[PDB]
Subunit: 244 residues, 4 copies
């Protein structure tokens, strides 16, 4: 029970087959109580109920400061603490550089980058008061190698911005024992019928796509005491797609 | 004459003491014609005239699509091409994580990240038609080491986002011979404490960054794309 | 347990205060049977018996092909398989660039780099035949930041060489499901005040911190990780 | 003239079509006097003579401490200084992990890693006495991505070791204004080549001149604030 007695908040975890839900499931299996925060309250509550007993579902647009703060307050009122924050919320968009409109940039940057800032801002005060915590930020191999997988350049930019933000927060809050680390998943199977799949898989030494559970297990590592001396780390979960 | 016959557009180069102006000066010394794009028209025109003859100054907020489009069109009308784009425009703010407000995030992200996207989007079509080009993006050591110098976490995020965008554009446009690379300057001219962690024992100069931009803009780097080039005096070795 | 039913060979784990022994202890706690390989037979046997029941201690210089072959053969004859290889053996020397002599270079490079190659060469065939495995290599933050901690430039070079070797083996054997990853520990408890000032988490590393990262890489929790360099440095190097 | 008045020592530059010779040519074009150090004295002297006037060829196995020291002494006696050291000497071998014998490891590590240490050790004292210098070490994309190009794992290891050594020397000698930086070339000029080429965004293999031009940047005052840098010259083959 790596997360026995811990409380974890995971954004974007209402969807059944997503990385967020897989992380919630594994966290609950490891003894944590999980707060799922996503756009739809009913979907978030149903996901939390599916995890088991003692979990919570809340609704928030991660780019809405006041809604995020209100949701975090409800979580803190019930659980009294948040030990772990998984900033998993994020959207991709398979368009190319010259097709990125202002509204596309805003949507993609808001969910990943602004949402990570806002949710981290909302949780950090209680983590300081509680003597520490672990924040895991979701980036992407696209931020490191310059896309070429699915998400367009604004997604690569947003997820690279997440890395810069995470490292800056790691440095600022190390003295408060708030560890901040990032995951850079490769090509992960979620919601492969195109011939382009062959080229990508040919570039993965392990010879398979990633699973949501693979990312969840790396998040478990960073959320747990097994990584107590890690902060500012970028942990690649890409099957060798990017070795560097 | 490393940039003989070339045309370079440099954003944020109107101020005399900035990296942008230092880059414009060195580029002009190396034979390039320079288009300075900055917020103030008169300041940009005066900076261009200070470089010498044949240069141009235009006014645009890099985060304003309409103003950027008008500036690039004026530049192309006069020069017929843009060989080099230096996305130097950027602002910083020394505020910590919990104090970053929506307007702070928007301002800092807009000048660096959105500005790099908008200006690159405006110039890339002509570069594709003209057989290639060199785009240099300005990041920061803060994007790599997690701040701790001056700019707050939203600056670190914006400059890290610039790296991600630059690499994505490098991959997309390699077949068009549009090279896209980034500079990660260290502390460029409390200072004593930072200076103690710099192996070369001095702060960076605007000319140091300009010379690295010159390398990336010139044919000396014809086989480099997607590169992040540290200009930090050893402050960050990794 | 995370390593239930697994067999792990750990080099350099005879000493009680080392990263190797801490890794052996945590691996045994997680259900693995551990083969300790180190220079002294009696010390390695005593360390293996201290872990519990069903473990093994063998003597070998990791830079000696014949001794490594003999040790791996004895381990395979008893356990029939090696699921996990922790290339923890390594030595350091606090000497500066101009003072590194041929014998200093040879000793430091042999234990870390040549030893990682020789031990990996000896274990890979059985891993390939058995359907995969996990190899963890021990590097150092010194390989990334250019020393400045304790080990001299030949130590930084040796541990950087380990990274290059590990990545090359990761790429070669990915299709065989042999994962190869590296740890880059910071300053571990195995002048301190000055270094401590540059560590955001405000403490030095513990052998258990490195062991726990090795546990992650050795376990199925990292089944999709190969070619990774995993920093265990408390924020000393953020990059 | 980016290297006007400078003296540069380049190892492994005797061969006509190599990166070393291309670097020597470009350095000479930029005003430097070049000392070519390679295994064969006759080949090195002929290469230096081909550069133009005022250059020098010397013989040394970079893994022989005393021969390297004697060669550097001859260079310093003639030129009085060495401003720039290009540790270009290196050999590769296309053999896979399980086929690397002790002798293969020794040969590959000796030319690249031990040779870089020995030649740097031999030149650094004069650079300290002269107020600084620039040392450029030759690594490879193989050290970063884990091979897969041509050189086997021991080549990837040797070239990664070079990076670790270079960064350590950069940190040690920054106060002496001895800059130490590394180049990581990609695939530099059939099925294997075609497959690799398909993963290069710029759509071509590198040329020796591409690497030489990056060495010129690092050797020149254009990079005066760079030390400890790893500069990729790979056409986008590895973006990271």
């Amino acid at each position: 029970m790596l997360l026995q007695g811990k409380v974890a908040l995971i954004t974007g975890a209402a969807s059944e087959r997503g990385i967020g839900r897989a992380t919630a499931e594994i966290f609950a299996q490891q003894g944590a109580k999980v707060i799922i925060v996503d756009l739809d309250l009913a979907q978030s509550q149903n996901a939390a109920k599916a995890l088991g007993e003692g979990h919570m579902g809340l609704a928030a647009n991660v780019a809405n400061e006041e809604q995020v703060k209100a949701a975090v307050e409800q979580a803190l009122q019930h659980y009294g603490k948040i030990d772990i924050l998984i900033n998993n919320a994020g959207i991709t968009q398979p368009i190319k550089t010259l097709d990125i409109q202002r509204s596309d940039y805003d949507r993609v940057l808001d969910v990943s980058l602004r949402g990570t800032l806002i949710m981290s801002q909302a949780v950090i005060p209680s983590m300081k008061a509680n003597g520490g915590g672990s924040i895991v930020c979701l980036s992407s191999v696209s931020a490191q190698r310059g896309g070429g997988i699915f998400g367009g350049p604004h997604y690569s930019a947003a997820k690279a911005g997440v890395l810069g933000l995470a490292k800056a927060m790691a440095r600022e809050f190390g003295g408060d024992q708030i560890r901040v680390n990032s995951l850079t998943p490769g090509l992960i199977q979620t919601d492969m019928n195109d011939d382009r799949r062959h080229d990508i898989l040919a570039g993965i030494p392990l010879g398979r796509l990633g699973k949501a559970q693979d990312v969840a297990n790396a998040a478990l590592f960073l959320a747990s005491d097994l990584s107590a001396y890690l902060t500012g780390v970028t942990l690649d979960v890409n099957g060798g797609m990017l070795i560097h």
